Design a protein around this nucleic acid. Structure first.
Ligand code: CL
Ligand code: CL
Ligand code: CL
Ligand code: MN
Ligand code: MN
Ligand code: MN
Ligand code: MN
Ligand code: MN
Ligand code: MN
Ligand code: MN
Ligand code: MN
Ligand code: MN
Ligand code: MN
Ligand code: MN
Ligand code: MN
Ligand code: MN
Ligand code: MN
Lengths: 99, 106, 97, 86, 99, 79, 105, 94
DNA sequence: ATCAATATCCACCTGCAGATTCTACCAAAAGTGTATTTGGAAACTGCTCCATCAAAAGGCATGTTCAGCTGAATTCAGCTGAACATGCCTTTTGATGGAGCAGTTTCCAAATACACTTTTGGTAGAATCTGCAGGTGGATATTGAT
DNA sequence: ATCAATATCCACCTGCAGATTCTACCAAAAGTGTATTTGGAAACTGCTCCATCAAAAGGCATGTTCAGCTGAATTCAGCTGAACATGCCTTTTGATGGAGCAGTTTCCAAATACACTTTTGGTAGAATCTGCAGGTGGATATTGAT
């Protein structure tokens, strides 16, 4: 007989998993293309040290995870458990990033 | 005879090199004798403070060699180190396990 | 072809690593991090010290400058112990010559 | 001979990876509006870092962004990164 | 006839007034004592330049006004118009002040 | 004591400049806490600058340098 | 017989700015054009703020720039604002701004 | 002794953009703090920039790159202009 | 929205005090004219390290179904926070004087910067070692349905 | 208060990829012996700075009344999580051409180091002005009631 984890159970599982973890969470190549695109729109004919592309990813994923923490706090603050774009915006406004 | 300044101060960190880095760093025109010693000492103290805390983490986590995760556990769990490196990102560090209470089921 | 030596704080970090955990070794990315930590803090102190010399119209950075620097930069307790260590390291360095 | 044409690559930030990141952030439930919002924020974030890093590159008369360029870049942007040189 | 403005009206009035003005809002002496009390916890026999006590008040009021701004935004975020300590705390955490 | 000198009306005034309309009664004591932490950190750093200059009087520059090095640059007393 | 400031067409003192560079522990040698260029940049920014502030002053029917004018001048400009995001202007006050949901009716 | 300022220059500049207007003294100092501040950011970044490239000399080029890094884009562009201008003029005079 | 009546605001004028501008001078910066240094820009060039390219494989990204539980919309009473007038007292503020100190000078002994001339400590690959990363298979929780 | 379905843990194993140790030059410490500076250590100013004093004045502390807001309780459509079938493209592993760092040499345009020689920018009294703070008297706004 078919068996289902209740909604929100795999999420908690997923949190405990990824926080215990240390690995990059964005795919290596899709991100590198993004980097080479954005860069190229600012300057052409650019080469990148494989380490420089990694350094950027490390920083970016660091940033986004940090950002999602604060986001999740504004969601809870608003008596919700679901993050919304409104929450990201409050986080960023207060972080001073662009108020 | 050979005696090194590092050993003359009872330090592992290299008082010599740190005196040169000061002189060569556009910090001031003349560098005092004790400045590189005092700094080598402080840099040495902190290195140890972090390293001991990190070593515990590596051992608490079953392992014999300290990796980045460990330094991150060591730093983010120490209220004072954590303030010292509040703006610092440790590659391959991960995050401290933390789940808001309102999120657990009952 | 004859790489111009790129010098590090590695061997010292290792020594101290051994003094606290003779047990444990360190991964190279971890070593590198640590190496980034030492250079960082070096610069913070050395900078603040630079400023302090400027405000007192002194041309010279003395263990006294580094100390005020360390007090401003470090948190309590890390500051207190770090001061001690420096003060100790310095007078011992005096007492030898 | 010629280079390939890069475009729409911010979609490489797949919805699974945005969720993965939120999880590490400790996020339990995610609105569908988030993923496209996130892509926005990530691109702004990334642009500004790459702008500066590349500015360090050209100043050093180079064509290859070095890992140190990103590090300096990140640093003068308030986000010091350990792991790649100091 | 005794006459009453409805709740929240003089508040709005007060807001428009104080945003239009530039004056320090904490009284100078109570503050000066506060400065001198706190300071002697660090070193004794201390004197203060009038400019130094003033600089501080400017900084404190700048800080607090900024903080009430970011706080009122968290109050709004929770579908309220009343700032509460939750709000001040959420602001201080996201500012990174003491998370 | 002296914090309490930071009166509820003055606290209410600052809030007003902030665009705050309605204020919980619990805010005031919370606010006094933040203000004392803020001040402490600034002053601690200021007096250190004092002590470094072998002085017994905190100068306005000591406050500025303190503020500057804490992320809160202040124009108007500098120089 | 003739100063570097006027030689570059500047009000700001290329002379002093060269001494301050030398004496600021920035690098061992300071370039010939660097103090000109820097002095040039500083004057521009000064002028930029000042006009914006003068405009602020006349709009409150005043002929003398006070801080409020400088604060109004700065925070109403998207770019100067980004430049001095971390700066506090004593006696500056804040921009009149009130969140909508707080308005009545 | 003499404690020097940027006051007279700020004022000179105040007049050629606005000859109408005068400047409050407390406002004059605000501006003075602004000039010294920005002075320092540029000069600091400039110092750093020379280090990254193992150079002993801060040149107009270093000041420029600096200015591109500190100033926002519209403000950065105009400042580079004015800066290049004053340099080329001072080059060409002697 | 009108009908009226407290209070709030806003304008135009007005007299003066506090600052602001304007004037009259001198050490200390700034500008010069030399005498050298010296950094770093150019011109080869030995060589890591990037950019492609390819080829095979499953780890995952996509897309669809489907229903649980969250968010949003509504309602409402208890009670907290605003407005207001009173009564009181702490803050203001204005000299007035004394004294604690910043702020300057004037030497000098101590400490530092140089200029070379030896002496190691560190560093860069080669030469060994050895955690632990991945892969299995059973014990131990955790979770969700009768 | 139970079992059936998964997911989580923990141990035990084994070859390699990555860490540690071993060796050997060279850049950089270190040791000496001149050749400068500088950061204080005392003697004294003038100055802001604390300490009062003494009224006056608003600004604050209280208490009352109640408007309206925050929090609670219920409800529901439909959004977002869990699960699955499919196959895409990312990840891995290896090879190759060559672009572009990086490292050295070589050598002037540029910067510094003096030595004087101007000039400017700062300081302390001098000389008008701009708002502030009040003063009517005129519409506005806010609120209570046909
Ligand atoms: Cl130049
Ligand atoms: Cl060795
Ligand atoms: Cl003249
Ligand atoms: Mn299943
Ligand atoms: Mn130990
Ligand atoms: Mn009117
Ligand atoms: Mn004279
Ligand atoms: Mn597919
Ligand atoms: Mn709900
Ligand atoms: Mn040896
Ligand atoms: Mn394992
Ligand atoms: Mn709905
Ligand atoms: Mn003159
Ligand atoms: Mn008026
Ligand atoms: Mn008026
Ligand atoms: Mn009237
Ligand atoms: Mn009624």
């Amino acid at each position: 007989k078919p068996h289902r984890y209740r909604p929100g159970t795999v999420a908690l599982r997923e949190i405990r998993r990824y926080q215990k973890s240390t690995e990059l969470l964005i795919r290596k190549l899709p991100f590198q293309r993004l980097v080479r695109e954005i860069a190229q729109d600012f300057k052409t004919d650019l080469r990148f040290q494989s380490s420089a592309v990694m350094a950027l990813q490390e920083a970016c994923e660091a940033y986004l995870v940090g950002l999602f923490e604060d986001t999740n706090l504004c969601a809870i603050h608003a008596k919700r458990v679901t993050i919304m774009p409104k929450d990201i915006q409050l986080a960023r406004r207060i972080r001073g990033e662009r108020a | 005879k050979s005696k090194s300044r590092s050993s003359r101060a009872g330090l592992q960190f290299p008082v010599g090199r740190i005196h040169r880095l000061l002189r060569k760093g556009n910090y001031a025109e003349r560098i005092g004798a004790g400045a590189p010693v005092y700094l080598a000492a402080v840099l040495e103290y902190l290195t140890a403070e972090i390293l001991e805390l990190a070593g515990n983490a590596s051992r608490d986590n079953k392992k014999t060699r300290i990796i980045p995760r460990h330094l991150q556990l060591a730093i983010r769990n120490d209220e004072e180190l954590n303030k010292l490196l509040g703006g610092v990102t440790i590659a391959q560090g991960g995050v401290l396990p933390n789940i808001q209470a309102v999120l657990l089921p009952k | 072809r004859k790489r111009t030596r790129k010098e590090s704080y590695s061997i010292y970090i290792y020594k101290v690593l051994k003094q606290v955990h003779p047990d444990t070794g360190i991964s190279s990315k971890a070593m590198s991090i640590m190496n980034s930590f030492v250079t960082d803090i070096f610069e913070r102190i050395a900078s603040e010290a630079s400023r302090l010399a400027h405000y007192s119209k002194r041309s010279t950075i003395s263990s006294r400058e580094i100390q005020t620097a360390v007090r401003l930069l470090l948190p309590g307790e890390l500051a207190k112990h770090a001061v001690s260590e420096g003060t100790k390291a310095v007078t011992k360095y005096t007492s030898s010559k | 001979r010629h280079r390939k044409v890069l475009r729409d690559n911010i979609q490489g930030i797949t919805k699974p990876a945005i969720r993965r990141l939120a999880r590490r952030g400790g996020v339990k439930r995610i609105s569908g509006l988030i993923y496209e919002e996130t892509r926005g924020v990530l691109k702004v974030f990334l642009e500004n870092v790459i702008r500066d890093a590349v500015t360090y590159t050209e100043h050093a008369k180079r064509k290859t962004v070095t890992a140190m360029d990103v590090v300096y870049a990140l640093k003068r942007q308030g986000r010091t990164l350990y792991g790649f040189g100091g």
